[PDB]
Amino acid sequence: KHNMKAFLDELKAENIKKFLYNFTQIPHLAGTEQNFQLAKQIQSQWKEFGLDSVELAHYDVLLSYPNKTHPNYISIINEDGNEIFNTSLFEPPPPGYENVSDIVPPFSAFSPQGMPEGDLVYVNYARTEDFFKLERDMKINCSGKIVIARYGKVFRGNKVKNAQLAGAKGVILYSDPADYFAPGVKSYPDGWNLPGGGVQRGNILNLNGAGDPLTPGYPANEYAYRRGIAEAVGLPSIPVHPIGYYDAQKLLEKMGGSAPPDSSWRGSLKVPYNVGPGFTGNFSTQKVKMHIHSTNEVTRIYNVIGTLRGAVEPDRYVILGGHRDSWVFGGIDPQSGAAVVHEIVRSFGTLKKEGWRPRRTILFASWDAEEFGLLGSTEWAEENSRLLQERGVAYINADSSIEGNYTLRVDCTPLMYSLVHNLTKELKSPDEGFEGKSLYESWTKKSPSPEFSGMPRISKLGSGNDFEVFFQRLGIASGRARYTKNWETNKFSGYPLYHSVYETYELVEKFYDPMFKYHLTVAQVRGGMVFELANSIVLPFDCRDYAVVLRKYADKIYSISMKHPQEMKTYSVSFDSLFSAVKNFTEIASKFSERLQDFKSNPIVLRMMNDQLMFLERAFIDPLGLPDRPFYRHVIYAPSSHNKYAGESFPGIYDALFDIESKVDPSKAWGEVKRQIYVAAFTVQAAAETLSEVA
Amino acid sequence: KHNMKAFLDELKAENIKKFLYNFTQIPHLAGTEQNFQLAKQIQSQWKEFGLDSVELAHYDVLLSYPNKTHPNYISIINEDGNEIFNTSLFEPPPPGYENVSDIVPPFSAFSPQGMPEGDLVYVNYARTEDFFKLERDMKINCSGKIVIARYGKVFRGNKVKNAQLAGAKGVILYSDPADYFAPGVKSYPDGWNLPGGGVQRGNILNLNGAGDPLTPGYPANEYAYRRGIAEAVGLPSIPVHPIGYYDAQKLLEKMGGSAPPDSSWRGSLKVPYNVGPGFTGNFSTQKVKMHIHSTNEVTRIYNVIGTLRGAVEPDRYVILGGHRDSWVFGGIDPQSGAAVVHEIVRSFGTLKKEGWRPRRTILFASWDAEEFGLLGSTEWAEENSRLLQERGVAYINADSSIEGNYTLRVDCTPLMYSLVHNLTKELKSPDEGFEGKSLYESWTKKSPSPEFSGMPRISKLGSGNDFEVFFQRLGIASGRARYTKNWETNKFSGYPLYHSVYETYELVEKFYDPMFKYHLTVAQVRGGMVFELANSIVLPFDCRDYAVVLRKYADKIYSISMKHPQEMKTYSVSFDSLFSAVKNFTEIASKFSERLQDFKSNPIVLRMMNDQLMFLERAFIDPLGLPDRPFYRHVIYAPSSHNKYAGESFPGIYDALFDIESKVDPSKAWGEVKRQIYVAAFTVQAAAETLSEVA
Ligand SMILES: *[C@@H]1O[C@H](CO)[C@@H](O[C@@H]2O[C@H](CO)[C@@H](O[C@@H]3O[C@H](CO[C@H]4O[C@H](CO)[C@@H](O)[C@H](O)[C@@H]4O)[C@@H](O)[C@H](O[C@H]4O[C@H](CO)[C@@H](O)[C@H](O)[C@@H]4O)[C@@H]3O)[C@H](O)[C@H]2NC(C)=O)[C@H](O)[C@H]1NC(C)=O
Ligand SMILES: *[C@@H]1O[C@H](CO)[C@@H](O[C@@H]2O[C@H](CO)[C@@H](O[C@@H]3O[C@H](CO[C@H]4O[C@H](CO)[C@@H](O)[C@H](O)[C@@H]4O)[C@@H](O)[C@H](O[C@H]4O[C@H](CO)[C@@H](O)[C@H](O)[C@@H]4O)[C@@H]3O)[C@H](O)[C@H]2NC(C)=O)[C@H](O)[C@H]1NC(C)=O
Ligand SMILES: *[C@@H]1O[C@H](CO)[C@@H](O[C@@H]2O[C@H](CO)[C@@H](O[C@@H]3O[C@H](CO)[C@@H](O)[C@H](O)[C@@H]3O)[C@H](O)[C@H]2NC(C)=O)[C@H](O)[C@H]1NC(C)=O
Ligand SMILES: *[C@@H]1O[C@H](CO)[C@@H](O[C@@H]2O[C@H](CO)[C@@H](O[C@@H]3O[C@H](CO)[C@@H](O)[C@H](O)[C@@H]3O)[C@H](O)[C@H]2NC(C)=O)[C@H](O)[C@H]1NC(C)=O
Ligand SMILES: CN(C(=O)CCC[C@H](NC(=O)N[C@@H](CCC(=O)O)C(=O)O)C(=O)O)c1ccc(F)nc1
Ligand SMILES: CN(C(=O)CCC[C@H](NC(=O)N[C@@H](CCC(=O)O)C(=O)O)C(=O)O)c1ccc(F)nc1
Ligand SMILES: *[C@@H]1O[C@H](CO)[C@@H](O[C@@H]2O[C@H](CO)[C@@H](O)[C@H](O)[C@H]2NC(C)=O)[C@H](O)[C@H]1NC(C)=O
Ligand SMILES: *[C@@H]1O[C@H](CO)[C@@H](O[C@@H]2O[C@H](CO)[C@@H](O)[C@H](O)[C@H]2NC(C)=O)[C@H](O)[C@H]1NC(C)=O
Ligand SMILES: *[C@@H]1O[C@H](CO)[C@@H](O[C@@H]2O[C@H](CO)[C@@H](O)[C@H](O)[C@H]2NC(C)=O)[C@H](O)[C@H]1NC(C)=O
Ligand SMILES: *[C@@H]1O[C@H](CO)[C@@H](O[C@@H]2O[C@H](CO)[C@@H](O)[C@H](O)[C@H]2NC(C)=O)[C@H](O)[C@H]1NC(C)=O
Ligand SMILES: *[C@@H]1O[C@H](CO)[C@@H](O[C@@H]2O[C@H](CO)[C@@H](O)[C@H](O)[C@H]2NC(C)=O)[C@H](O)[C@H]1NC(C)=O
Ligand SMILES: *[C@@H]1O[C@H](CO)[C@@H](O[C@@H]2O[C@H](CO)[C@@H](O)[C@H](O)[C@H]2NC(C)=O)[C@H](O)[C@H]1NC(C)=O
Ligand SMILES: *[C@@H]1O[C@H](CO)[C@@H](O[C@@H]2O[C@H](CO)[C@@H](O)[C@H](O)[C@H]2NC(C)=O)[C@H](O)[C@H]1NC(C)=O
Ligand SMILES: *[C@@H]1O[C@H](CO)[C@@H](O[C@@H]2O[C@H](CO)[C@@H](O)[C@H](O)[C@H]2NC(C)=O)[C@H](O)[C@H]1NC(C)=O
Ligand SMILES: *[C@@H]1O[C@H](CO)[C@@H](O)[C@H](O)[C@H]1NC(C)=O
Ligand SMILES: *[C@@H]1O[C@H](CO)[C@@H](O)[C@H](O)[C@H]1NC(C)=O
Ligand SMILES: [Ca+2]
Ligand SMILES: [Ca+2]
């Protein structure tokens, strides 16, 4: 029979291995010839795997690259202007890859050019609270200083925005062993830790969902009208560069001025972690000088779009998407995900060649330029937004399949919670000590829900990956799954070799998943979810799960507000409307659920309830967007204004409440709280009403 | 049988007559008790007529009313400050209505309060070109002057905005017999002309689709958060008041300064129509003083919403809507339309009681506060926008059924052109000399298409009525139809007694439609269109008709641009992308049409092509809206920036080109032309692509 089990059993660990090896022998940087040739290989193979159509969709977008003949570096300069210390021009390439060309040296994509000279201030992780501590508590002024911050905790783009708003004239990012060196593990190539010469690449934009900086709202097609660079969205205004911890030690060891304010500001190097500004007495006349010569350039990018036409509802689209572009070899990020997508396509294609077709259309995507700001997925969705909003059932992301080997990690819309629970109960756990047990059992055991015993943790979607346009702009139900580490026993940030040259096939095969069994399990979870979304007669969404989280989020935003009881009295700040809307949502969702369970080969009633299910995510979109963030349109979920990676619930209210006690005009600020309460209450009630009887 | 003919034959002229009489014996001003009691009567009757459900939807919105104890008026004052002439405090009530209370005196709804004193400047119709002539050609400065303008040609709100931007400190509006007195016809009550004491009421807002001034984007429900008045949308900043032509003669007869610049500036009074500023020599020290004391007040309004549930596609909505609120008795505006809606409901209800149901759901609406800025329809649509955008097939408006007795007038989306042609070929002409001929024949004869012999004229939708939210904000196919005058033989504006106390039942029964046959024909057209939209198995829209008009509009916007050949060369301004998109739209629409004609009791293919048809209007919506007009989101059609009543095609391009030769930075201005060309081209291609095969 042609059922989910036939699909899942066709998936092979050994095929994933082969594809990963194939995808990671050379660098595939967005906008380079090698990434175009890999796109053409993916297109050809998806066609031979059996998809009905596979096309390239290309766009011309702003990318950023270092100058090959004028390298970026940082110096300590003396009184006279001599450069007495210079940071590295490249990461020591891994064993066997020392003759690979076209390895892009470490840089901060989209840095402006500059040669700023000045005194260092150390700002910890450069979080919002870190700058609060510096400015308000320690009375340190960053204006005209170069700030040095450790990577970790938050998106680097938020660090740069925070530094900018504090008046820094440049930013140095570095990897502290406290955050990127797990105790007892060796450095690559003998272990999975970051060595001292290793450096994390990454973009430092603040795009807030805009896509290509030059064409917000519209696809960067052949006749697109582009903003000039001065009006581009999201570019930083001060130079930025990343370094490793051998270099960082040399910049930090001479720091003077104030002591760190507590141990949460000290990493693991043998330095005092003084905050500055500037160096101690003997070296006080020495300065730091940045040399940045990267250029921004409009460059062609290529997405691969494959289509498996639905037999019954070809106008309903389930999308499996992940990126192809990498910073260097991309052994984890993204090729451990793309290898998995490639095997999923192969499996669906073998069913297709035996005569099967899914009920709904499945679209497969190999996105380009994700590393430069989610540009490929965003421009494609801008191009096709009318199709996606009227026909998009769901979007399943497929970047890195592993960042650890401990247990499963799922972030998704509440609408997919029951789907995930049910699917993981039918899959085998790959974990040692859980032979013959379900993935649900092992996952639940190692990652319990904080709210309910006997269930596993499923997190909110944040951002920093290609589902952003589909979920937060367009309101299509979205989700992601991968294998992860134990975040309890280990206090380091993501995985140590993230965005480094050392992220290789060998990293994965030697130290993460030698049997490719974790990969295979992630393929079954992603593949399984897509199968169920594309094939179940009733869409596998449970509106009642949204009702439960909405109450949780309402309670949580109310508790933030109730830190300010006097102001709530003075300004008549009531959450009554939001709680009322949530109660109504609960009631209506419960009655909808009964109709769904109880409605006869009547395809119109079915479709009309599949359309109610599909448009429920869509109902939380506000076409006016959030304040000063027009492309974040979902009212329940947005990326945190302080950390793009983290999701925030009732973001409009959260941001109106944040730091409200430091606003100069409290009537005005509490007015905007009330406004946002009204917006949320209205939108929740409106979402609820899409599930009432239609007439 | 239960077919369109049974529906149409059940409609009765004599029922329309009775309903009109019933709806026009007392004033039904928005926000007054009498309009609430009429809402409750409509609700009860629609229930007894057989609808499945009839509810009131109420909102609390900003309205405007004169002060009962502090009347608005205008004076000529002398040197000493004596008021030597005062305009009327009320229109002489018509015969038999002289004891009706609660007749609102003439005023400009939403005028601010003020007592400005100054010299008069006469600005003709206060159009954009009128102010150009004054300022640029005649060198007359309106700054600090009171301007007097004749009603006609454009929405009065645009006149007030133009006066404001010219620096006027107040505006006096008046009705010139040139525009409101048809030669050879007598004054009410002996004819249908405006007498000298008659005055046109109306709002002077510039809302640009926003709805309630205090709650743009969101319904004005019980917990709504309201802008303060200073941040309200669309309110004028200078006092404004309307007068009749006896009063106007007294203000104009002493005007001095420059002569009118040509005969297009002279109306029909025995005055020179001098432009001013100020009065001639003997009276030069006399001034005009306005006394305005109207107040803006948040007031409850009530829409009546009736539902006739669909038997097959209950989640697809065809809406018939028109307003109930009137300035005074509303004999034409709106009750000649509402009487027609009431008979349509009665007819559909008689079919329903014999067991019939339409295929799709039909919603019927009696909107409130249309006269105060389309507030009822807008707030309801803001409330229900998610339902309407995913389920709204079409919206058929039903304000005034007559403004003349010569022939039919239709304004609608190109998608309904074939529907209208086919329906009017099956209806009987009510016209003298066309006994036994079709409405199509008589209409085509008296109102030929300018483009094609053998077809009738169908115009673009403008604005100034309740379809605005449904069409220009939400992208639901919309249309309207009424009986109209011969605009050829008569050079007057709309109908003379528009928004005057003299608009009565007797006006209609004596002078417009004594047999109610024109009413009945409009009921058959509106009713017929609703029937066909709600009941035809394939939605009655022809995508190919959009292709034809899009080419016409492209040619037209290109010709405007080509008035500037040097700039088009210098700035590389190409319309190629827009013509390419239009050609593609034509090709794809033609292939879609063949699939539609040729696709088998397969309900999913049918529905998937009914969804393609229904979402085609929707595809022309840009969620970022037009520049500085976020609630005008349709890219093909918007209300003219110079005249809310008139439709403009490719409005984004049109406005970027308007007066472009007077902009200071031509590179910047031609850049914005190119930007708008790109937006239009992209949107047309995107609309076309919603009609390709779905997978
Ligand atoms: C969660 O769901 C419930 C429904 O189960 C919603 O309940 C509605 O609550 C609103 C308040 O936001 C009620 O509003 C009130 O309506 C009264 C009239 O309602 C009756 O008549 C109307 C016709 O217009 C019918 O639609 C309706 O069914 C009732 O028959 C008004 O008279 C009230 O105004 C008066 O009191 C208020 C408050 O003290 C004053 O400010 C006013 O000035 C005025 O004196 C009021 O507007 C509404 O009736 C409720 N509908 C019900 C019970 O069916 C919740 O609103 C919803 N939650 C959210 C957040 O949407
Ligand atoms: C009306 O409909 C037609 C389709 O019938 C559209 O035609 C497209 O036109 C665009 C231009 O806007 C063409 O774009 C060109 O694509 C070339 C590659 O296309 C081939 O390969 C791709 C894979 O990426 C396939 O998708 C495609 O089917 C072809 O096989 C590029 O190489 C071109 O770029 C080169 O030339 C240009 C122009 O001189 C340079 O600026 C570039 O730098 C580069 O040198 C170009 O991008 C596209 O192929 C056409 N599609 C077709 C024919 O199927 C119209 O665009 C459409 N109208 C509107 C307004 O949308
Ligand atoms: C995840 O799996 C669970 C458990 O299998 C699914 O819930 C179950 O779904 C079925 C089908 O709707 C329910 O069956 C119903 O039983 C009652 C009789 O008591 C009757 O109302 C219906 O005729 C129908 O047969 C079953 O009750 C329900 N079990 C629950 C809620 O515990 C759940 O739907 C799955 N989620 C998905 C697919 O997203
Ligand atoms: C308005 O009325 C006209 C004329 O009746 C409608 O056009 C006609 O629609 C019918 C049904 O699609 C077409 O019939 C077709 O005939 C051909 C054989 O030549 C075949 O392709 C199909 O099997 C079908 O029977 C007819 O050709 C067509 N006539 C035209 C275009 O002249 C029009 O659809 C109506 N518009 C509406 C309802 O909006
Ligand atoms: C655990 N963790 C992560 O998973 C970060 C997401 C990394 C990865 N995303 C990613 O690299 N995206 C790119 C582009 C993101 C964008 O431009 O929005 C990047 O962040 O530079 C992913 O989604 O798997 C994390 C959190 C905080 C931190 F500082 N470092 C890593
Ligand atoms: C012929 N003609 C009209 O039909 C104007 C539309 C009048 C009527 N609409 C209407 O009165 N709407 C109200 C409210 C309009 C709004 O606030 O958008 C008004 O205009 O004051 C209708 O749509 O039938 C016209 C054109 C120009 C002019 F100056 N006077 C009348
Ligand atoms: C990755 O796999 C592909 C597909 O097997 C290899 O590409 C093929 O290479 C052979 C031998 O050069 C050619 O004859 C085919 O035309 C290629 N097929 C394609 C592109 O569809 C590719 O070379 C492998 N890459 C590495 C690094 O091993
Ligand atoms: C990358 O850096 C190089 C070399 O240091 C730049 O090339 C120089 O550009 C300047 C200004 O145009 C010229 O006056 C020199 O003659 C060039 N020098 C050499 C060695 O060619 C180059 O322009 C930079 N590339 C960019 C900005 O993309
Ligand atoms: C750091 O790098 C700089 C730039 O390459 C070095 O300084 C240059 O050295 C050459 C050769 O001595 C001089 O002729 C240049 O004028 C110098 N350029 C600048 C910009 O200073 C410097 O020696 C390096 N420092 C260390 C410690 O290796
Ligand atoms: C793959 O899984 C193994 C099994 O847990 C990991 O290795 C162990 O890590 C724990 C937890 O910190 C230590 O107590 C043990 O000393 C390690 N044992 C062995 C056999 O090495 C391994 O680290 C995982 N790989 C990655 C990259 O996380
Ligand atoms: C308009 O028509 C309605 C309905 O026939 C009249 O309202 C009815 O009046 C009678 C007699 O007073 C009452 O017994 C009914 O309760 C009313 N029915 C309703 C409101 O549904 C109304 O009075 C007529 N108006 C005029 C001005 O003639
Ligand atoms: C309407 O006009 C009247 C009377 O000319 C206003 O009533 C006066 O308001 C002022 C200011 O509040 C008081 O000082 C007077 O004592 C009132 N006079 C009378 C005759 O009552 C009234 O407030 C206005 N109504 C509004 C603004 O809605
Ligand atoms: C125009 O109206 C005003 C206001 O009612 C009249 O002037 C008032 O007249 C009374 C009685 O003579 C005076 O006591 C008031 O002081 C006046 N008020 C103002 C504001 O001037 C005026 O007479 C009327 N003019 C004409 C020609 O009828
Ligand atoms: C209703 O229809 C009649 C018939 O055309 C209109 O009256 C005529 O108007 C024409 C055109 O200007 C004149 O030539 C005739 O003198 C009029 N004839 C009669 C019989 O009155 C009448 O004006 C229409 N009603 C309205 C309000 O337009
Ligand atoms: C920080 O530095 C500059 C002076 O160089 C000054 O303009 C700015 O306001 C300072 N802010 C402080 C001291 O808070
Ligand atoms: C019109 O009037 C005032 C002077 O009272 C002045 O400020 C304004 O600029 C004038 N504009 C002209 C003369 O163009
Ligand atoms: Ca873009
Ligand atoms: Ca509103």
Ligand SMILES: [Cl-]
């Ligand atoms: Cl992912």
Ligand SMILES: [Cl-]
């Ligand atoms: Cl109308």
Ligand SMILES: [Zn+2]
């Ligand atoms: Zn990635």
Ligand SMILES: [Zn+2]
């Ligand atoms: Zn990455």
Ligand SMILES: [Zn+2]
């Ligand atoms: Zn009206």
Ligand SMILES: [Zn+2]
């Ligand atoms: Zn009106």
